[PDB]
Structures are given as C-alpha cells and as structure tokens.
C-alpha cells in the first residue's frame, strides 16, 4: 500500500476478514489482506502474464 | 479522445483518422468502374464550374498511369496529386527492375502500400483518397479492377462506386450487373456506366467523362461527341 489514509487501512483489513469467511476460513492470513487491496483498486488479482 | 494520433487507439480498435478520411472522399466527386467481358470502362463525374474555367488546363479526374494501367480518383485533389506521380514512378520502376510491362496486382498493392506506410506511422497522416486502379496485361486477358482505401487496404471488386453519394449509385449497379454476366460488348459496358452516372450528375452531358481500356495496351479517351450519343440513347429508352 502507498497513499492509504487511516480510514482506508481499516477498509482493507475488515474487508479481508469477509473474504476469508467466504473461502471457508474463520481467521485472516497474510494473502487475504492483499486481496482486500484489490477491491480499492480495479486490478485483477490473478491474471496470466501477457499484459502483466 | 483517441482521434489525435495514429499511435492511439480507441477501445474498439479504430484510428478515427481513417474513418474521417472515408468521409473526406465524399467531398470529391463520384467515380464508377464497371468491367465487361473484354474491357473495363472507367467513368467519372467531371465538373464544369464557369466559362472562365477550361478543360485543357484544368485537371482531369482520370489520369493514365501508363499505357496499360489507368487510374481514377475521388478525395482531395492535392493529396491525389502526389499519389499519382508517385504511382507513375512505381509503375516505371517495375519495368526498370524486371523489364516487363507493369502488373495491375503489383500496382494496387504498392500504391496502397504507400498509404499503408503512412497509416502505420504515427507522426504523419496518410492520404484521404480512395482510387480505382484498373488495367490489363499483354499476357493475361482477364480484365482487372482494383480499389484502394485510405487505410492502405486494397481490395478487388467486379464493379464499384466510390466518391460522392456512392452508396446510392451502388445499389442500382448491383441489380443490373451479374458476376455471371457482365456487359458483352463495349458499347453496352458504356451504356450501364452512363446509366449509373446520370444519377450523380443530375443533368450535364459535358459533365459525364468516359475512358475505355481494353487489352494489348489500348486506352482511349472518348470525344465529347461520342459521350453525348450515349446520353441521348439512354433518354430514348428511358
């Protein structure tokens, strides 16, 4: 992250626990936070190398 | 805004310059090409503006590339000018290298290739002209009529209209023309070419220009008097 203010930082972490809940987990992990960030942005999380 | 360079595309993949170039054709007057069984007639709308203007010294809308290839055009007159001399030299350079009379395939492919080269480049516009390149060869008896478009794409068509209100002239030509039977005689090839042009001229039998190209390096440009017999012949049947 870069240029995420207090409010935003909380938005990614809370968001990352929702994501984890859907998957089947009941605790957060490192990877899930990364997934929280990809909601703020319009980036695709997983896409094949042929433009990225 | 993606119509600012030929190095920027729209999300649909167009370079609007080419699209706006096609609208530029429409500014220039119509040109019509129609092949027969043993000829091609390449006929065009000519402009008579004033008594002061001449015809001798006032550009034709047909320019002859060589003695066995002819070329008509529609677009801005300045843009086609550089293209025609350029076309003529290319046509000569064929014979210089190979030592043979110019192929019509070779000619449409290089000439639109000049257009293509410009379109590929992002720092310069290409021309805003669409042409007909019609011809024969001394070896091949098959009559050929080719097209260029401002994208630098060349296509071949049996009969085509391009230029001013081309679309309307097109629909009439479809019906009369058959790929199974094009016009058998030359005079009949001319009658159809005239019937199509009547539409764009409104009235003006000095404003209809006819040229005929046949194999074995026969190009003729018809006298005013000859163009006039068709117009009168078409009004008696009409």
């Amino acid at each position: 992250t870069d240029e995420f203010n207090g409010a935003q930082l909380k938005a990614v972490t809370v968001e990352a626990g929702m994501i984890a809940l859907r998957n089947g987990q009941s605790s957060v992990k490192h990877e899930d936070f990364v997934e929280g960030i990809s909601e703020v942005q319009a980036r695709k999380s997983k896409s094949v190398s042929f433009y990225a | 805004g993606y119509d600012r360079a030929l190095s920027i595309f729209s999300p649909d993949g167009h370079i609007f310059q080419v699209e706006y170039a096609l609208e530029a054709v429409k500014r220039g007057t119509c040109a019509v090409g129609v092949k027969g069984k043993n000829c091609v007639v390449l006929g065009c709308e000519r402009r008579s503006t004033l008594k002061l203007q001449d015809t001798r010294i006032t550009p034709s809308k047909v320019s002859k590339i060589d003695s066995h290839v002819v070329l008509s055009f529609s677009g801005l007159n300045a843009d086609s000018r550089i293209l025609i001399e350029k076309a003529r030299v290319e046509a000569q350079s064929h014979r210089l290298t190979l030592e043979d009379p110019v192929t019509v395939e070779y000619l449409t492919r290089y000439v639109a290739g000049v257009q293509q080269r410009y379109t590929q480049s992002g720092g310069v516009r290409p021309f805003g002209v669409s042409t007909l390149i019609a011809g024969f060869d001394p070896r091949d008896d098959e009559p050929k009529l080719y097209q260029t478009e401002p994208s630098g794409i060349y296509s071949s068509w049996s009969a085509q209209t391009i230029g001013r209100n081309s679309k309307t002239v097109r629909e009439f030509l479809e019906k009369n023309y058959d790929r199974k039977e094009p016009p058998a005689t030359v005079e009949e090839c001319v009658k159809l070419t005239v019937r199509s042009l009547l539409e764009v001229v409104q009235t003006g039998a000095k404003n209809i220009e006819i040229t005929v190209v046949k194999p074995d390096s026969d190009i003729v440009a018809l006298s005013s008097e000859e163009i006039n017999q068709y117009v009168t012949q078409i009004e008696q049947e009409k």
Binding site: - | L6, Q17, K26, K51, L52, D54, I57, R81, Y118, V124
Partner: protein, 241 residues
C-alpha cells in the same frame, strides 16, 4: 478543437489549417489576372501605403521566376519570399537539364506538391500563398493558372484572388468577351480594382502591372513591367485621375 496540427482531422474530415490559409490570402489586397487572346495582363493591388512609403525600388507582389513565366502574389509576404525563390530555382533547373524553358503545368504542380507535402508530413507549417502563374508554353499557348493554398491548381481565362474575391470575379466575367484586346484587358483591370479597393483615388502607386505578350516581339515570350509614368497615363484614359 482539432486545429492543433495538420495530421489531425475533425469528425467531418476537414482540416481547419487549409481553411485559415485560404482566408490569409483575402486579408491582402486584390489581385487580378486576365488572359486575352493578344496577351495575358497581370495587375495587383498595394495593401500598404504610407506617405513616406516608397514602392518605386520594387514591386512587392510581382516576381518573374523565369524569362517566360511570372507570378503575382497574394498572401503573407514572408511566406511568399521562400517559395518565389524555390520556384525560380526549379525553373532554371529545368533550363539546365533540358536546355528549354519549363512548361506552366509542371511549375505549378511542383509548388502545390511542396505546399501539400507540409500538410502530409511533419511538424512544418502550411504556407498560405496563392500565385497567379501567367506563362506561355507550346502546349496550350497562353495559359493563366492560379494555385490554391489548399495545394492544387486550376486553369483560367480570368481569376481574382486577394481581397474582394466574389466582387472581382463577377465584375471581370461580366465584361469578358472570349476574344479581348490586350488594351481592353488593361482598361478592365483598372476599373474592377477601383471598386474593390477602399481608396477612392486609384493612383499609379497603388498599382503593380505587367503585360505579357508573344504577340509583341514575335518568336519571343516577352514579359514587360510598366513604369509609373506609363501607369499614370492609363489612369487618365480610364478617367480615374
């Protein structure tokens, strides 16, 4: 707007640069060329005049580019300068190469190509200058042309560019007769120039003039600029002065 450069077109496929360059010609004075059977007369108008201005050292809108073809000038004069020289050099290049003088149609064609070429490629500006080419070649005898700032040419028996183009054109063609005497050609020029021009008293110093004849000094294309004292006389025959 899409007037940022030559490369870029509007939705409709017109280019504004061409349009501005036409308008440039009509913000400098009327220029009239008349072809007649017995000669082609050129006449032009001075857009400048101050009381201490001199204009007797040179004509600022008439240059001979060759000893048989000469041009009258309409547009910005700095732009004009560059091209006048390019044409005259090209003329003599023809003379060097072929040992005979340049045909009119080639000469015009060369400059419209150069002018279009500035539109077709690069960053370079188009150069809005309209030349009226009056020449003689064995192809079509006397020939009067003009060049567009749109970068193409059209043949003529009369044309007017510069200020009041509409006004000059109808007036010239109304008093046109297919034949035309070279004296009447002169008389006509002066009459249409007075009406167009907002200086009430058309004096010889507001006039540039040349008459071009092969009917005078036969076997030889001879272009002759009138001097002030000759221009002064003809004004009294037309009754201006």
């Amino acid at each position: 707007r899409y007037d940022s450069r030559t490369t870029i077109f509007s939705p409709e496929g017109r280019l504004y640069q061409v349009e501005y360059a036409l308008e440039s010609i009509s913000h400098a004075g009327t220029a009239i060329g008349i072809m007649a059977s017995d000669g082609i007369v050129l006449a032009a108008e001075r857009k400048v005049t101050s009381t201490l201005l001199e204009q007797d050292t040179s004509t600022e809108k008439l240059y001979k580019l060759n000893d048989k073809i000469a041009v009258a000038v309409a547009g910005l004069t700095a732009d004009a300068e560059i091209l006048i020289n390019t044409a005259r050099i090209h003329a003599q290049n023809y003379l060097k190469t072929y040992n005979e003088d340049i045909p009119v149609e080639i000469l015009v064609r060369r400059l419209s190509d150069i002018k279009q070429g500035y539109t077709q490629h690069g960053g370079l500006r188009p150069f809005g200058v309209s030349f009226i080419y009056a020449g003689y070649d064995d192809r079509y005898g006397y020939q009067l042309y003009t060049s567009n700032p749109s970068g193409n040419y059209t043949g003529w028996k009369a044309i007017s560019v510069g200020a009041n183009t509409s006004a000059a054109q109808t007036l010239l063609q109304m008093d046109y007769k297919d034949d035309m005497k070279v004296d009447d050609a002169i008389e006509l020029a002066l009459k249409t120039l007075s009406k167009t021009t907002d200086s009430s008293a058309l004096t010889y110093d507001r006039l540039e003039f040349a008459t071009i004849r092969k009917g005078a000094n036969d076997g030889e294309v001879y272009q002759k600029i009138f001097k002030p004292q000759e221009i002064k006389d003809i004004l009294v025959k037309t009754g201006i002065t």
